[PDB]
Every structure is written in structure tokens, then in C-alpha cells.
Amino acid sequence: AYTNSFTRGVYYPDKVFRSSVLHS
Amino acid sequence: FQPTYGVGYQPYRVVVLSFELLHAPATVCGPKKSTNLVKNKCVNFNFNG
Ligand SMILES: *[C@@H]1O[C@H](CO)[C@@H](O)[C@H](O)[C@H]1NC(C)=O
């Protein structure tokens, strides 16, 4: 059986705080 | 290991201290004292190193 992930499974990549920014 | 062995073949105890020096809260620190905080003024500072 299968289903679609869509956009699931993003996580905070490091223990830093950031705001209003398009981080890569 | 026998105490008669040549220096390279003698046992050595090894300890490796591995640091997670992360951008994350501290739980191990060096012997630093701490001051009161100061606000709205130009200060030299040190938080967690
Ligand atoms: C992917 O999921 C769909 C869900 O309808 C399925 O039909 C398809 O066989 C699956 N393909 C692979 C390669 O898993």
C-alpha cells in the first residue's frame, strides 16, 4: 500500500533562532 | 600486558573527552563566576563562553 507525503517531514535543522528570513 | 614489555607494547589508559560545543543550552561549564546583568548600556559580555 502507498500514500503521498505532500509537504510532510520538515524539521528545525539546528538549535538556533531566526526570524523573517529565507534560510537554506 | 606484562610489565616487562617495551614502551610501545605497554598498556596506556586513554580518555577521549568529546564536546558537543553546540548552539544549544549548556550543562557543563568551566569554573567561571557570574556577575549581575546590565541593560540599555554598551557592555562587554560573555554568555556560556
Ligand atoms: C506509488 O503510489 C501509488 C498510489 O496510488 C501507487 O499506485 C504506485 O504503484 C506507487 N509506485 C511506487 C513505485 O511505489
UniProtKB/Swiss-Prot annotation, chain B:
Domain of life assignment: Viruses
Region Disordered, residue ranges: 23-45
Effect the entry attributes to changing residue 23 to P: Increased resistance to human covalescent sera neutralization
Quaternary structure, from the entry: Binds to host ACE2. RBD also interacts with the N-linked glycan on 'Asn-90' of ACE2. Cleavage of S generates a polybasic C-terminal sequence on S1 that binds to host Neuropilin-1 (NRP1) and Neuropilin-2 (NRP2) receptors. Interacts with host integrin alpha-5/beta-1 (ITGA5:ITGB1) and with ACE2 in complex with integrin alpha-5/beta-1 (ITGA5:ITGB1). May interact via cytoplasmic c-terminus with M protein. May interact (via N-terminus) with host bilirubin and biliverdin, thereby preventing antibody binding to the SARS-CoV-2 spike NTD via an allosteric mechanism.
Protein function: Attaches the virion to the cell membrane by interacting with host receptor, initiating the infection. The major receptor is host ACE2. When S2/S2' has been cleaved, binding to the receptor triggers direct fusion at the cell membrane. When S2/S2' has not been cleaved, binding to the receptor results in internalization of the virus by endocytosis using host TFRC and GRM2 and leading to fusion of the virion membrane with the host endosomal membrane. Alternatively, may use NRP1/NRP2 and integrin as entry receptors.
Designated name of the protein: Spike protein S1
UniProt source species: Severe acute respiratory syndrome coronavirus 2 (2019-nCoV)
Gene expressing this chain: S
